Amino acid sequence: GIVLFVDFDYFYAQVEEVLNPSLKGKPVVVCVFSGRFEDSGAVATANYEARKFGVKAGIPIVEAKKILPNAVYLPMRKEVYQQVSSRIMNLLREYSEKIEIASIDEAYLDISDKVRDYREAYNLGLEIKNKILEKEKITVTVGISKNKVFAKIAADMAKPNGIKVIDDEEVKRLIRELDIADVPGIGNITAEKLKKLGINKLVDTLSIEFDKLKGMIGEAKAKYLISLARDEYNEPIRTRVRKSIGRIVTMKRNSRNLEEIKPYLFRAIEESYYKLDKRIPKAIHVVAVTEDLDIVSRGRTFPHGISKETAYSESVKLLQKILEEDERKIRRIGVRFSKFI
DNA sequence: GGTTGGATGGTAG
DNA sequence: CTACCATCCAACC
Ligand SMILES: [Ca+2]
């Protein structure tokens, strides 16, 4: 069981570097701009010179602007990076045909066939790294071990433009002195929830009862963490697929008014049908983030696929229903497409 | 255990 | 923020 996990360095902000190579060795800040008062939104990426002063993904742009007004701020042509991204997954493919893609900047090979050992994986890892740079000029950080986790952590280690191999030995020393924060899948909140309760490293979850675990952080992650602490996590490298496809866009203000919301709600359906391409969903869900931050889904499931027109007037009915149940003015809206054929 | 309800939170790029 | 998944009461074949 050998894994070859690849990961595209500060990807979005990195592609803007290669595109405009007069944008480099400098603070770059890829941004999703919301629309409201004189900028507003949140960071989706920043290169390392940016995020060495704190300007990291998901923080209000005004901070990014109040730590690095120096910086370069660029919008977020997610389409574009997608283009460039897909092209990489082809290269990752050539060298092993069990390519589990995850996020736009990430993917895993189960190369256990075109390697006899780990020495040879490093050599390959350099190959891939050398082919992705050559053809698209994008540095990426490979990571290698027994499993998609250890593979990922090893990348988390020498993260920017790097390559590491966690054999079995280092597999075991991590578990003891690897923090639950640094354990992929586990975002902070789970960690801080665990952090609070005396609970830091991953192995500590073996000195703790199970029902006092799914009674805080839940099963999937309860077991998931206990399995790697036991080490019995070496589960498969299988491709990923999309259930939902949505777009909740920010309105001009807060509106209890069928007509006010409509074009925003129709603009969503619109773009939602950009990203959907050839495919055809059975179910639809009209999302609403209110005045405050409540979230007010109502939805509908068919025994057929939906068609865009159908998708508009059904959306409204599903919106009408938000207004004789909610009474609070609504300040964000969108749609969602579950259940594909 | 399936399956369609909706409300929240957690994990990302 | 935008996007997507998981996650947990609630009905009910
Ligand atoms: Ca990544």
Side-chain angles (χ1 to χ4, degrees), chain A residues 5 7-8 103 105-106 152:
Chain A
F5 167 64
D7 160 66
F8 314 164
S103 78
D105 68 11
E106 251 184 32
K152 176 156 177 152

Side-chain angles (χ1 to χ4, degrees), chain A residues 21-41:
Chain A
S22 210
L23 203 57
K24 207 139 175 130
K26 269 212 306 104
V28 178
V29 191
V30 179
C31 286
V32 145
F33 277 111
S34 98
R36 312 193 58 161
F37 97 102
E38 215 272 353
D39 314 340
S40 51

Side-chain angles (χ1 to χ4, degrees), chain A residues 30-88:
Chain A
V30 179
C31 286
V32 145
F33 277 111
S34 98
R36 312 193 58 161
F37 97 102
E38 215 272 353
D39 314 340
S40 51
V43 173
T45 313
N47 50 21
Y48 276 106
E49 27 278 77
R51 63 187 50 156
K52 217 144 278 57
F53 296 69
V55 182
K56 58 176 211 178
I59 91 161
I61 293 167
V62 301
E63 265 84 80
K65 228 80 138 61
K66 93 129 78 295
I67 289 98
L68 300 193
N70 296 273
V72 186
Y73 296 89
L74 311 159
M76 209 289 289
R77 304 175 271 176
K78 158 66 153 45
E79 56 149 286
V80 175
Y81 317 135
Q82 191 62 48
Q83 344 248 78
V84 180
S85 170
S86 267
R87 302 209 278 291
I88 291 159

Side-chain angles (χ1 to χ4, degrees), chain A residues 45-226:
Chain A
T45 313
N47 50 21
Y48 276 106
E49 27 278 77
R51 63 187 50 156
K52 217 144 278 57
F53 296 69
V55 182
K56 58 176 211 178
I59 91 161
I61 293 167
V62 301
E63 265 84 80
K65 228 80 138 61
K66 93 129 78 295
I67 289 98
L68 300 193
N70 296 273
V72 186
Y73 296 89
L74 311 159
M76 209 289 289
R77 304 175 271 176
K78 158 66 153 45
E79 56 149 286
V80 175
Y81 317 135
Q82 191 62 48
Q83 344 248 78
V84 180
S85 170
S86 267
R87 302 209 278 291
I88 291 159
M89 303 312 186
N90 288 16
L91 318 199
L92 315 202
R93 259 193 263 264
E94 277 173 57
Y95 330 130
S96 141
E97 226 68 76
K98 282 198 166 45
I99 176 168
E100 169 170 347
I101 289 165
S103 78
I104 189 169
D105 68 11
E106 251 184 32
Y108 289 94
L109 282 343
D110 198 347
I111 64 166
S112 296
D113 295 358
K114 304 184 292 122
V115 272
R116 300 142 159 178
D117 41 9
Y118 277 137
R119 194 281 281 166
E120 275 178 51
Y122 228 105
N123 181 261
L124 188 81
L126 296 186
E127 197 164 31
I128 302 130
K129 196 163 159 81
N130 256 3
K131 207 63 184 285
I132 292 166
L133 185 64
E134 268 22 280
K135 301 285 271 303
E136 312 277 334
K137 222 137 162 183
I138 287 290
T139 85
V140 300
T141 291
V142 307
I144 320 183
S145 197
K146 333 201 312 147
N147 55 54
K148 279 155 65 183
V149 176
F150 292 131
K152 176 156 177 152
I153 309 153
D156 298 5
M157 291 210 56
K159 255 217 209 84
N161 195 348
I163 175 155
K164 193 195 192 78
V165 155
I166 298 189
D167 65 35
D168 285 5
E169 301 212 297
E170 222 220 52
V171 154
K172 319 301 259 189
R173 91 171 48 102
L174 264 178
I175 281 155
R176 293 188 292 166
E177 273 138 50
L178 192 176
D179 303 61
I180 287 165
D182 304 301
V183 166
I186 299 283
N188 202 22
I189 292 153
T190 276
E192 300 310 292
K193 244 176 276 195
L194 295 162
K195 184 153 197 167
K196 261 195 296 186
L197 281 285
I199 295 148
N200 302 337
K201 301 294 190 296
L202 200 166
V203 58
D204 296 331
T205 74
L206 302 175
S207 80
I208 203 292
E209 299 214 319
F210 168 49
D211 312 317
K212 283 204 138 55
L213 220 321
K214 75 178 246 54
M216 207 64 170
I217 97 174
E219 270 174 9
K221 301 193 217 67
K223 317 235 206 112
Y224 176 83
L225 289 175
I226 298 176

